[PDB]
Design a protein around this ligand. Sequence first.
Ligand SMILES: O=c1cc[nH]c(=O)[nH]1
Ligand SMILES: O=c1cc[nH]c(=O)[nH]1
Ligand code: SF4
Length: 192
Amino acid sequence: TLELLQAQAQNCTACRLMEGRTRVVFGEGNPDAKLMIVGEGPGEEEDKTGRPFVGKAGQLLNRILEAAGIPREEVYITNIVKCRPPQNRAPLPDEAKICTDKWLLKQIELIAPQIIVPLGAVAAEFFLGEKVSITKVRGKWYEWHGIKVFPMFHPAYLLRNPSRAPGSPKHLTWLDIQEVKRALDALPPKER
Ligand SMILES: O=c1cc[nH]c(=O)[nH]1
Ligand SMILES: O=c1cc[nH]c(=O)[nH]1
Ligand code: SF4
């Protein structure tokens, strides 16, 4: 079950990221979510609480979801890696592979989402099967194992580049989340 998997993950020592962590950040939300959001890795506040997207970038994500009319409790949120990399660096290829093989793939199998929104280039690369430019792939529909994939900018990028001008990261993200909401509402019932 997802709950057993979550419990087991708390004791994971599969990669070097276990060395500097405080708490494993497995993921949270609706276990039967139609929409799954996947970020890069935990930040400082996530590492302290064991919860994903609760720091500054997470608060922005909450604003984005609320504005789109998507209740956070109804979606499932996690990341490519479950442990905070040193000084918020991106996870290395071996860390991402080990963590996704051990946890993420099983989470996706159990939750069975119909739409996956990878936030940032690292998460986007995992689902698109190759290294990609987040600015070029964001806001477009792809597919991974029969699941719809819609890459979007990482909220941290929006905080680092907070311009309100037309075509800015924030503006494009608003357009993107509205598209996610539209697609979510048009989804057929899950195959059970
Ligand atoms: O949960 C989180 C928090 C910050 N950054 C991420 O990629 N994920
Ligand atoms: O980028 C965005 C989109 C929606 N709402 C926000 O606060 N920021
Ligand atoms: S990042 Fe993933 S694989 Fe590495 S120790 Fe944490 S839970 Fe295990």
